[PDB]
Write a protein that binds this ligand. Structure first.
Ligand SMILES: *[C@@H]1O[C@H](CO)[C@@H](O[C@@H]2O[C@H](CO)[C@@H](O)[C@H](O)[C@H]2NC(C)=O)[C@H](O)[C@H]1NC(C)=O
Ligand SMILES: OC[C@H]1O[C@@H](O[C@@H]2[C@@H](O)[C@H](O)O[C@H](CO)[C@@H]2O)[C@H](O)[C@@H](O)[C@H]1O
Ligand SMILES: *[C@@H]1O[C@H](CO)[C@@H](O)[C@H](O)[C@H]1NC(C)=O
Length: 705
């Protein structure tokens, strides 16, 4: 009655094989209020399944203390998908990558005794078996696995370990074995998948991720061919362009897979959404996870991509009865043109006509009728006769993004952040420099490195008007340099190379000089071999040239630390906290001023358009609406990179259809309709870089052809 098994062909849901069209919708990147409309948009788009990760570090802020409220009501989210007649692929992880802060591991886990991440390690295995079992027991509890009549038809253990395992060697393989056996062991009564495991143990199905994976094949023949991440674009990194992937090529990629015994494919992403707060953003990942997905960050339809995939699904579902009762058989149709024919003993016939030439439309002869195949396309013939769909012919009207203000420029108040300096009574100190994750435990992006640089009165630069050289080398990711109160320097990294060096002459004078270094993180690293062990914050070396001695090693003094900002320790983002300091009303409003808090109240704009914040006036920091973390703003970083005009045809890569070069890397910042009330809306912004808060205006998203 209720069963999920599999064969060499496809997934068997209820004794019936199925070709499963699926979409990734990460729950914590939406509001619970948006969930059902997004899920409905998915249903209308031709999706059978909704895929998501579980967010380990969202769910356990500290050991044993869990959070499944609001955006993290996972059981609610799965139930809502079930409510929509769609299935669920639950990729538990707990490592999930997903451009998510620290890959999803809680930071506290890093510091458990004897701990190592993703390897045959006792502390790690225990904590991981722990979380995976808690989630599965929560899922089992309300019969949410399909064997019990629920939506979950599949689960994922780890995420993309194959590459990491190929480098760690024997521990890695001894952990891949372990992870598979001690997840299957939870007896969920539905299959377990692993993506990028050329070596996944029976009975775990290895899947792939990529732009194209028509070449792929499971690690044993009685496993079906499964595509867990059809990338629908790419992530937007801070100071990067907005990566698009064209819909004629996504169609083309999916059809290339399904024509070749493809049975499960999942768009990553279907809905991208927002990295809300300082707990979401992976390293350098911008607040927008829009991902050029078929639903944009704001849940509106990305046309014609949405419409064009909707039609492809329809064309697949007309083909499905053939697809499930035969196998993909091939027949050359010319130099670079092919035919994949699903012909059932009963009489069903589905035919995929392919044309792999990236330049020239080609006409082929199939079963006596002519067919014109536009270049880099496939024509779907669900009857083997009428081409009802072609992955180049786009029959959905486009829709372009328009942001149009409403609410009017608000009246602002300011508050300035203390620029702290060393004090002979600081408690948190050491000789030499400490790593940032170690000190902050990721309670805040901000860490103050402070020390005393004494300068003897007989110095060369105290004779000739001249400044000593300051050189600071920090693991990342932003660094502000403060001398005796005033700001001497500001340097920042990219995703690829987050390490930085500040070099510059610095006005010191005889006696004790104050050095205060503000190192900031932009989320934690989320991917790579041993990514967890990477450093952040100032580890040096730190020198001061132009002295008599010659060049002073400042890394070998007493340094003192202070975690995070005062405004944070006050929580000036919440209504209670924001009424506790003297705000600077009137016209003295700090303009183009570093380390400044801002504050305005406004009324919900008109009706039912999605909203955002224009902040191209500002530099960098965080936004909060009504005490909830909107996310990080960083319009000060200008999109670096190639932005050639783009053709659908030919092999794709992230870099192909890059957009928005020269502009702020994210101008607009998403604000849920569900986070506003009619009036009394407390906007609070921390500006870390300097900007003019008068230019902050609310906007409405809408689209037209
Ligand atoms: C789809 O799957 C079928 C089944 O695996 C593939 O056809 C097989 O081809 C191999 C040799 O290449 C034979 O050993 C199998 O017995 C074949 N099965 C059948 C039913 O013919 C087929 O190649 C796959 N499709 C594509 C496009 O590769
Ligand atoms: O949206 C990005 C996507 O990355 C996937 O991971 C990929 C790896 O499987 C592959 O080996 O390298 C890619 C970069 O070249 C990338 O790291 C994740 O599976 C997925 O969660 C998501 O982060
Ligand atoms: C981490 O911090 C602890 C306690 O605050 C300290 O004992 C240790 O030296 C630090 N280690 C680092 C930065 O590697």
């Amino acid at each position: 009655e209720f069963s999920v098994s599999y064969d060499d062909r496809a997934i068997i849901i209820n004794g019936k094989r199925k070709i499963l069209i699926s979409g990734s919708i990460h729950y914590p990147r939406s509001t619970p209020q948006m969930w059902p409309d997004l899920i409905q948009k998915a249903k209308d788009g031709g999706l059978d399944v909704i895929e998501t990760y579980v967010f380990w570090n969202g769910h356990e802020p500290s050991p044993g203390k869990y959070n499944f409220e609001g955006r993290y009501d996972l059981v609610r989210f799965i139930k809502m998908v079930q409510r929509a007649g769609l299935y669920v692929n639950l990729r538990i992880g707990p490592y999930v990558c997903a451009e998510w802060n620290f890959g999803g591991f809680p930071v506290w886990l890093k510091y458990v005794p004897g701990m190592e991440f993703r390897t045959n390690n006792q502390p790690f295995k225990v904590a991981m078996q722990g979380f995976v079992q808690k989630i599965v027991n929560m899922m089992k509890s309300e019969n949410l696995f399909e064997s019990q009549g629920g939506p979950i038809i599949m689960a994922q253990i780890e995420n993309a370990y194959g590459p990491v395992e190929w480098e760690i060697g024997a521990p890695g393989k001894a952990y891949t074995k372990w992870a598979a056996q001690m997840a299957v062991g939870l007896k969920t009564g539905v299959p377990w998948i692993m993506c990028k495991q050329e070596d996944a143990p029976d009975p775990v199905i290895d899947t792939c991720n990529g732009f194209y994976c028509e070449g792929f094949r499971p690690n044993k023949p009685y496993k079906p061919k499964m595509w867990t991440e059809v990338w629908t674009g790419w992530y937007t990194k801070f100071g990067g362009p907005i990566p698009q992937r064209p819909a004629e090529d996504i169609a083309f990629s999916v059809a290339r897979f399904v024509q070749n015994n493809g049975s499960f494919f999942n768009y990553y992403m279907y809905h991208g959404g927002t990295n809300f707060g300082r707990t979401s953003s992976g390293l350098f990942i911008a607040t927008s996870y829009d991902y050029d997905a078929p639903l944009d960050e704001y849940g509106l339809l990305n046309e014609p991509k949405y419409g064009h995939l909707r039609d492809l699904h329809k064309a697949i579902k007309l083909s499905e009865p053939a697809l499930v009762s035969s196998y993909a058989a091939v027949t050359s149709l010319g130099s670079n043109q092919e035919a994949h024919v699903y012909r059932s003993k009963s009489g069903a016939c589905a035919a995929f006509l392919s044309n792999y030439d990236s330049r020239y439309s080609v006409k082929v002869t199939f079963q006596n009728r002519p067919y014109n195949l536009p270049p880099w396309s496939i024509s779907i013939l669900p009857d083997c006769k009428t081409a009802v769909y072609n992955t180049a012919q786009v029959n959905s009207q486009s829709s372009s993004i328009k942001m149009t203000p409403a609410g009017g420029g608000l009246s602002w108040q300011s508050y300035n952040e203390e620029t702290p300096t060393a004090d002979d009574s600081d408690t948190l100190t050491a000789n030499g420099l400490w790593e940032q994750k170690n000190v902050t435990r990721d309670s805040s992006d901000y860490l103050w490195y402070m020390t005393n640089v004494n300068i003897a009165s007989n110095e060369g630069f105290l004779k000739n008007g001249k400044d000593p050289y300051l050189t600071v080398m920090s693991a990342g990711h932003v660094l502000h340099v403060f001398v005796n109160g005033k700001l001497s320097g500001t340097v920042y990294g990219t995703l690829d190379n987050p390490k930085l060096t500040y070099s510059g002459n610095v006005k010191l004078r005889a006696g004790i000089n104050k050095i205060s270094l503000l190192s900031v993180s932009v989320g934690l690293p989320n991917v790579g071999v041993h990514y967890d062990t990477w450093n952040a914050g100032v580890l040096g070396p730190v020198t001061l040239s132009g002295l008599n001695e010659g060049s002073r090693n400042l890394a070998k003094q007493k340094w003192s630390y202070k975690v995070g900002l005062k405004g944070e320790s006050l929580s000036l983002h919440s209504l209670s906290g924001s009424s506790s300091v003297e705000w600077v009303r009137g016209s003295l409003m700090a303009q183009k001023q570093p380390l400044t808090w801002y504050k305005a109240t406004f009324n919900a704009p008109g009706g039912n358009d999605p909203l955002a914040l224009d902040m191209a006036s500002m530099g960098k920091g965080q936004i909060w609406i009504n005490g909830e973390g909107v996310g990080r703003h960083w319009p000060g970083y200008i999109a670096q990179g190639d932005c050639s005009k783009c053709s659908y045809a030919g092999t794709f890569n992230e870099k192909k259809c890059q957009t928005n070069c020269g502009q702020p890397s994210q101008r607009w910042y998403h604000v849920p309709r569900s986070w506003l009330k009619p009036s009394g809306n407390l906007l609070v912004v921390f500006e870390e870089w300097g900007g003019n808060p008068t230019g902050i205006s609310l906007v409405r998203r809408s689209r037209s052809a």
